[PDB]
Design an enzyme around this catalytic site. Structure first.
Site, PDB file in Angstrom:
ATOM      1  N   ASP A  25       0.771  -1.226   0.039  1.00  0.00           N
ATOM      2  CA  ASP A  25      -0.015   0.016  -0.006  1.00  0.00           C
ATOM      3  C   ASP A  25       0.853   1.295  -0.127  1.00  0.00           C
ATOM      4  OD1 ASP A  25      -1.838   1.872   0.322  1.00  0.00           O
ATOM      5  OD2 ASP A  25      -2.873   1.006   2.052  1.00  0.00           O
ATOM      6  N   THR A  26       1.035   1.887  -1.561  1.00  0.00           N
ATOM      7  CA  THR A  26       1.874   3.135  -1.391  1.00  0.00           C
ATOM      8  C   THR A  26       1.027   4.312  -0.692  1.00  0.00           C
ATOM      9  OG1 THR A  26       0.966   3.404  -3.424  1.00  0.00           O
ATOM     10  CG2 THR A  26       3.011   2.361  -3.373  1.00  0.00           C
ATOM     11  N   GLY A  27      -0.171   4.086  -0.335  1.00  0.00           N
ATOM     12  CA  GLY A  27      -0.938   5.286   0.252  1.00  0.00           C
ATOM     13  C   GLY A  27      -0.846   5.211   1.803  1.00  0.00           C
TER      14      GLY A  27
HETATM   15  C1  XVV Z   1     -12.670  -4.345   2.602  1.00  0.00           C
HETATM   16  C2  XVV Z   1     -12.504  -4.303   4.372  1.00  0.00           C
HETATM   17  O1  XVV Z   1     -13.454  -3.216   4.699  1.00  0.00           O
HETATM   18  P1  XVV Z   1     -13.628  -1.735   4.023  1.00  0.00           P
HETATM   19  O2  XVV Z   1     -14.542  -1.859   2.872  1.00  0.00           O
HETATM   20  C3  XVV Z   1     -12.134  -1.215   3.086  1.00  0.00           C
HETATM   21  O3  XVV Z   1     -11.275  -1.776   3.861  1.00  0.00           O
HETATM   22  C4  XVV Z   1     -10.022  -1.113   3.828  1.00  0.00           C
HETATM   23  C5  XVV Z   1      -9.335   0.058   4.366  1.00  0.00           C
HETATM   24  C6  XVV Z   1      -8.225   0.428   4.233  1.00  0.00           C
HETATM   25  C7  XVV Z   1      -7.257   0.239   2.959  1.00  0.00           C
HETATM   26  C8  XVV Z   1      -5.826   1.196   2.752  1.00  0.00           C
HETATM   27  C9  XVV Z   1      -6.411   2.676   2.145  1.00  0.00           C
HETATM   28  N1  XVV Z   1      -7.372   2.511   0.987  1.00  0.00           N
HETATM   29  C10 XVV Z   1      -8.719   3.207   1.239  1.00  0.00           C
HETATM   30  O4  XVV Z   1      -9.044   4.082   2.159  1.00  0.00           O
HETATM   31  O5  XVV Z   1      -9.353   3.044   0.042  1.00  0.00           O
HETATM   32  C11 XVV Z   1     -10.726   3.285  -0.135  1.00  0.00           C
HETATM   33  C12 XVV Z   1     -10.622   4.016  -1.261  1.00  0.00           C
HETATM   34  O6  XVV Z   1     -10.779   2.922  -2.351  1.00  0.00           O
HETATM   35  C13 XVV Z   1     -11.421   1.840  -1.873  1.00  0.00           C
HETATM   36  O7  XVV Z   1     -10.714   0.462  -1.887  1.00  0.00           O
HETATM   37  C14 XVV Z   1     -10.207   0.204  -0.523  1.00  0.00           C
HETATM   38  C15 XVV Z   1     -11.004   0.906   0.580  1.00  0.00           C
HETATM   39  C16 XVV Z   1     -11.612   2.100  -0.272  1.00  0.00           C
HETATM   40  C17 XVV Z   1      -5.119   3.460   1.892  1.00  0.00           C
HETATM   41  O8  XVV Z   1      -4.429   2.733   0.929  1.00  0.00           O
HETATM   42  C18 XVV Z   1      -4.175   3.617   3.085  1.00  0.00           C
HETATM   43  N2  XVV Z   1      -4.794   4.678   3.957  1.00  0.00           N
HETATM   44  C19 XVV Z   1      -4.497   5.919   4.033  1.00  0.00           C
HETATM   45  C20 XVV Z   1      -5.079   6.704   2.801  1.00  0.00           C
HETATM   46  C21 XVV Z   1      -6.542   7.370   3.381  1.00  0.00           C
HETATM   47  C22 XVV Z   1      -7.276   7.715   1.963  1.00  0.00           C
HETATM   48  C23 XVV Z   1      -4.167   8.271   2.669  1.00  0.00           C
HETATM   49  C24 XVV Z   1      -4.619   9.189   3.915  1.00  0.00           C
HETATM   50  S1  XVV Z   1      -5.486   4.257   5.491  1.00  0.00           S
HETATM   51  O9  XVV Z   1      -5.493   2.709   5.482  1.00  0.00           O
HETATM   52  O10 XVV Z   1      -6.457   4.761   5.941  1.00  0.00           O
HETATM   53  C25 XVV Z   1      -3.790   4.084   6.318  1.00  0.00           C
HETATM   54  C26 XVV Z   1      -2.699   3.173   6.669  1.00  0.00           C
HETATM   55  C27 XVV Z   1      -1.411   3.336   7.179  1.00  0.00           C
HETATM   56  C28 XVV Z   1      -1.244   4.617   7.945  1.00  0.00           C
HETATM   57  N3  XVV Z   1      -0.237   5.270   8.755  1.00  0.00           N
HETATM   58  C29 XVV Z   1      -0.345   6.454   9.365  1.00  0.00           C
HETATM   59  S2  XVV Z   1      -1.857   6.931   8.737  1.00  0.00           S
HETATM   60  C30 XVV Z   1      -2.403   5.730   8.075  1.00  0.00           C
HETATM   61  C31 XVV Z   1      -3.710   5.621   7.227  1.00  0.00           C
HETATM   62  C32 XVV Z   1      -7.947  -0.730   1.796  1.00  0.00           C
HETATM   63  C33 XVV Z   1      -9.081  -1.281   2.365  1.00  0.00           C
HETATM   64  O11 XVV Z   1     -14.313  -0.687   5.223  1.00  0.00           O
HETATM   65  C34 XVV Z   1     -15.594  -0.923   5.919  1.00  0.00           C
HETATM   66  C35 XVV Z   1     -15.073  -0.821   7.559  1.00  0.00           C
END
Ligand code: XVV
EC number: 3.4.23.16
Lengths: 99, 99
Positions: A25-27
Site C-alpha cells: 500500500d503506497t498510500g
Molecule cells: C474491505 C474491508 O473493509 P472496508 O470496505 C475497506 O477496507 C480497507 C481499509 C483501508 C485500505 C488502505 C487505504 N485505502 C482506502 O481507504 O481505500 C478506499 C478507497 O478505495 C477503496 O478501496 C479500499 C478501500 C476504499 C489506503 O491505501 C491507506 N490509507 C491512507 C489513505 C486514506 C485515504 C491516505 C491518507 S489508510 O488505510 O487509512 C492508512 C494506512 C497506514 C497509516 N499510517 C498513518 S496514517 C495511515 C492511514 C484498503 C481497504 O471498510 C469498511 C470497514
C-alpha cells in the site's frame, strides 16, 4: 517481481512466526496489521483514514518478511479490516511505482 | 517515471481543468478526491476505509491527467482526508509495483 494493479496487490508476509496476506500500500505511511498478540512493549497510537481514526498498538523494531524480502521496523496492530504494508517497510524491500 | 517511497508518492493531476495534488495509492480500489465542483451527472455512493464508511458523489467517465498520463474513468468526490488515485486509474496509466 512486477505486480500489476488490476487486482489488489496482496502478498504473503511472515511476522511473529506467522504467515499472513497483506496489501502492498503506497498510500499507507505506516504498516497496520490485524489483531495479533505480539510479545513485548508497545505504545498506544491513533491512525486516520477515510471514515476516521482507529486505535492501534505500536510495536517497534518488528521483523517482517515480504515475498522473501526482509524488513524491520514499526508495526501497528489494531482492528484494521486488512493487513497493510506501508511505505516504512516498502522502502526497505526496494519497492517502487513505475509507469 | 520510477517513484521511490521514502516520501509520499504525490503527483500533480488535472481534472475539470483544475490542477491538484494527489497520492498514488495502490491500497485504494477507487479514486477519491476532496470536495470540489465537477460538471456532469453523479450518483450517491458509499465507500469504506480504515475508519468506517463515508458518503461520496460518483462521477463516471471523467477525464483526468495524472503526471502527464491521461485516464478516463470513475472519480468519487467526498470527505477523504487526502486526494487519492486508486487502482481504477493506476491501471489506466500503466502503473505497476516493482521490487
Ligand atoms: C474491505 C474491508 O473493509 P472496508 O470496505 C475497506 O477496507 C480497507 C481499509 C483501508 C485500505 C488502505 C487505504 N485505502 C482506502 O481507504 O481505500 C478506499 C478507497 O478505495 C477503496 O478501496 C479500499 C478501500 C476504499 C489506503 O491505501 C491507506 N490509507 C491512507 C489513505 C486514506 C485515504 C491516505 C491518507 S489508510 O488505510 O487509512 C492508512 C494506512 C497506514 C497509516 N499510517 C498513518 S496514517 C495511515 C492511514 C484498503 C481497504 O471498510 C469498511 C470497514
Amino acid at each position: 517481481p512486477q505486480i500489476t494493479l488490476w487486482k489488489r496487490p496482496l502478498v504473503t508476509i511472515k511476522i511473529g512466526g506467522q504467515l499472513k496476506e497483506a496489501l502492498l500500500d503506497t498510500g499507507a505511511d505506516d504498516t497496520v496489521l490485524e489483531e495479533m498478540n505480539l510479545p513485548g512493549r508497545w505504545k498506544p497510537k491513533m491512525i486516520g483514514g477515510i471514515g476516521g481514526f482507529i486505535k492501534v498498538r505500536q510495536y517497534d523494531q518488528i521483523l517482517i518478511e515480504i515475498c522473501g524480502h526482509k524488513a524491520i521496523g514499526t508495526v501497528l496492530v489494531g482492528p484494521t479490516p486488512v493487513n497493510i504494508i506501508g511505505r516504512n517497510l516498502l522502502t526497505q524491500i526496494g519497492c517502487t511505482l513505475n509507469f
